[PDB]
Amino acid sequence: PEAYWNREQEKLNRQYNPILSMNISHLNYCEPDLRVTSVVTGFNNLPDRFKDFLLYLRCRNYSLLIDQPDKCAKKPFLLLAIKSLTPHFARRQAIRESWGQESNAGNQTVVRVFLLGQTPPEDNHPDLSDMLKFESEKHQDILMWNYRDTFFNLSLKEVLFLRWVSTSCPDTEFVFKGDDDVFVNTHHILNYLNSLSKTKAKDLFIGDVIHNAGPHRDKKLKYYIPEVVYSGLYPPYAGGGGFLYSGHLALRLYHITDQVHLYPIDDVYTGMCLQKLGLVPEKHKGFRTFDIEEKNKNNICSYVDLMLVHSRKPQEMIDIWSQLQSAHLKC
Ligand SMILES: *[C@@H]1O[C@H](CO)[C@@H](O[C@@H]2O[C@H](CO)[C@@H](O[C@@H]3O[C@H](CO[C@H]4O[C@H](CO)[C@@H](O)[C@H](O)[C@@H]4O)[C@@H](O)[C@H](O[C@H]4O[C@H](CO)[C@@H](O)[C@H](O)[C@@H]4O)[C@@H]3O)[C@H](O)[C@H]2NC(C)=O)[C@H](O)[C@H]1NC(C)=O
Ligand SMILES: CC(=O)N[C@H]1[C@@H](OP(=O)(O)OP(=O)(O)OC[C@H]2O[C@@H](n3ccc(=O)[nH]c3=O)[C@H](O)[C@@H]2O)O[C@H](CO)[C@@H](O)[C@@H]1O
Ligand SMILES: *[C@@H]1O[C@H](CO)[C@@H](O)[C@H](O)[C@H]1NC(C)=O
Ligand SMILES: [Cl-]
Ligand SMILES: [Mg+2]
Ligand SMILES: [Mg+2]
C-alpha cells in the first residue's frame, strides 16, 4: 500500500505473524522519526497535527504524573473512565455529582477515574496546574500522563489507560469509557450488566457501532485524513462518545495494542484492535451519539431506557440526573 499507516502496519503484521514469512522500536522510540519527511509525499505541506503524529508515532511509553494506585482496592463491578482535558473543571465536577458518583449498591462497586494528558505552556496553554493539583488532592479521581493531550493523541490516551487497567485494575468486571460531555444512565447500565449471562459478558463490547466507514478526504473537516496517510475502509467501531466492555476484554485489548500502530482517531483505533482480536463490536440502540429528538429532550421519560446521550452541558447532566432519580414514579 502507498498510504504510510497501511504500509507501516503491514510491516508490524510481518513482525508478529510468522505465516507472512514467505529496526528501531515501534513502541519506545521517542526521537523524531525523520524518515517520514522523505517517505511521505507532500509531508511538509501537511497540517502540523499530522506532522507531529507521524514524527512521534513510535513512542508510547509515557509515565503517570498523577496516579490513584488504590482506586481498585475494592474489586470494582463497573469502572468509569472519562476522557477529559485539564481546563474542564465544571464538566468533571458535574459528572462527580451526577451519573459518575462512586457507589456500592448491592455491593456492586462503581469507581471513577478521569483520564488527562498534559496541557503544557509550550503550546500556549494557561497554567492551571495548581488548580489541577487542588482538584486531584480533594477528589482523588485524576489520572494524568506526561504527553501532550491533543485530539490526535487520544489513541495514546486509550493505550495508556488500558495499560493502567492491566497494572492497577485488572479485576474490574466491566469498564465504561466515554467523553466528559455525555449524559450516562448509570442505573440503566448496571441493570443491563446484571441481565447478561457470563458467556455474553466475557467478550462484551457494545456501543453506537459504525460499519463500512472510511477516512474523510475533505481537508476542511475535523476527521480529515490525507490519502498519503491512510487508505481503504475503517473496521467497525463504536462511536467514542462512550462504549461498554468487560474487564477480561480490556486485558486482551491491551495485550494486542502492541501489534497495532496508533491512529489519529481514537475510536477507530479501538476498532482496529477489536478486529485483530477477531471480535466485532456490537451495536446497542441505547447509545445516542447524535442526541435524541427535539421534543423528547424535555421529557425525563425519554432517558429511562437510554445508555448515554451526546452531548450535554454540566448543568444539563445534573438536571437530568436529579429528575431521573424520581422517574420511576412518573413513567
Ligand atoms: C503526542 O504527545 C507527544 C508527547 O508529548 C508529543 O511528542 C512531543 O512532540 C513535541 C513536538 O510537538 C516534541 O518537541 C519537539 O522536539 C523536536 C526535536 O527535539 C530533539 O531534537 C532537537 C534537535 O536535534 C534537540 O534540540 C532536542 O533537545 C531533542 O533532542 C524539537 O526540534 C522541537 O523544537 C520546536 O520548538 C522550538 C521552540 O521550543 C522551535 O524553535 C523549533 O523550531 C521547533 O518548532 C520540539 O521541542 C517532543 O520531543 C515530543 N515528546 C516526546 C516525548 O516524544 C506529540 O507531539 C503529540 N502528538 C500529537 C499529534 O499531538
Ligand atoms: C460523541 C463522539 O463520538 N465523540 C468523539 C469525537 O469527539 P467530539 O467531536 O465529540 O469532540 P469533543 O470536544 O467532545 O472531545 C471528545 C472527548 O475527548 C476529550 N478530549 C478532547 C480533545 C483532547 O485533546 N483531549 C481529550 O481528552 C474531550 O474532553 C471529550 O471528552 O471524536 C473524537 C476523536 O477525535 C472521539 O474521541 C470522541 O469520542
Ligand atoms: C521510552 O523508552 C526509551 C527506551 O528506553 C527511552 O529512550 C525514552 O526516553 C522513553 N520515553 C519516555 C517518554 O519516557
Ligand atoms: Cl467546562
Ligand atoms: Mg511541527
Ligand atoms: Mg463531544
Residue numbers in the entry: 55 to 76, 89 to 397
The study reports:
β1,3-N-acetylglucosaminyltransferases (B3GNTs) are Golgi-resident glycosyltransferases involved in the biosynthesis of poly-N-acetyl-lactosamine chains. They catalyze the addition of the N-acetylglucosamine to the N-acetyl-lactosamine repeat as a key step of the chain elongation process. Among the characterized B3GNTs, B3GNT2 is the major poly-N-acetyl-lactosamine synthase, and deletion of its coding gene dramatically reduced the cell surface poly-N-acetyl-lactosamine and led to hypersensitive and hyperresponsive immunocytes. The luminal domain of B3GNT2 comprises an N-terminal helical domain (Pro55–Cys125) and a C-terminal catalytic domain (Cys138–Cys397) as well as an extended linker (Arg126–Lys137) that connects the helical domain to the catalytic domain.
By soaking B3GNT2 crystals with either the donor substrate UDP-GlcNAc or the acceptor substrate LacNAc, we were able to obtain B3GNT2 structures (B3GNT2_UDPGlcNAc and B3GNT2_LacNAc) in the substrate-bound states. In the B3GNT2_UDPGlcNAc structure, the donor substrate UDP-GlcNAc is positioned at the bottom of the cleft with the GlcNAc moiety close to the center of the cleft. The side chains of Asp215 and Lys223 are hydrogen bonded to the uracil ring of the UDP moiety, whereas the side chain of Asp246 is hydrogen bonded to the ribose hydroxyls. The pyrophosphate group of UDP clamps the divalent Mg ion in a bidentate manner. Two pyrophosphate oxygen atoms, Asp247 from the signature DXD motif (Asp245-Asp246-Asp247 in B3GNT2), a conserved His376, and two water molecules, coordinate the Mg ion with the tetragonal bipyramidal geometry. The side chains of Lys149, Asp245 (the other Asp from the signature DXD motif), Tyr289, and Asp332 are involved in hydrogen bond interactions with the GlcNAc moiety with Asp245 engaged in additional interaction with the nitrogen of the N-acetyl group. These interactions force the GlcNAc moiety to bend toward the cleft wall, almost perpendicular to the pyrophosphate and parallel to the uracil ring, and fully expose the C1 atom for the nucleophilic attack. And superposition of the B3GNT2_UDPGlcNAc and B3GNT2_LacNAc structures shows that the acceptor substrate LacNAc binds right above the donor substrate UDP-GlcNAc in the substrate-binding cleft. The hydroxyl group on C3 of the Gal in the acceptor substrate points to the C1 of the GlcNAc in the donor substrate at a distance of 3.7 Å. The Asp333, which is 2.7 Å from the hydroxyl group on C3 of Gal in the acceptor substrate LacNAc, serves as the active site base and abstracts the proton from this hydroxyl group. This facilitates the nucleophilic attack on the exposed C1 of the GlcNAc in the donor substrate UDP-GlcNAc, which undergoes an oxocarbenium ion–like transition state.
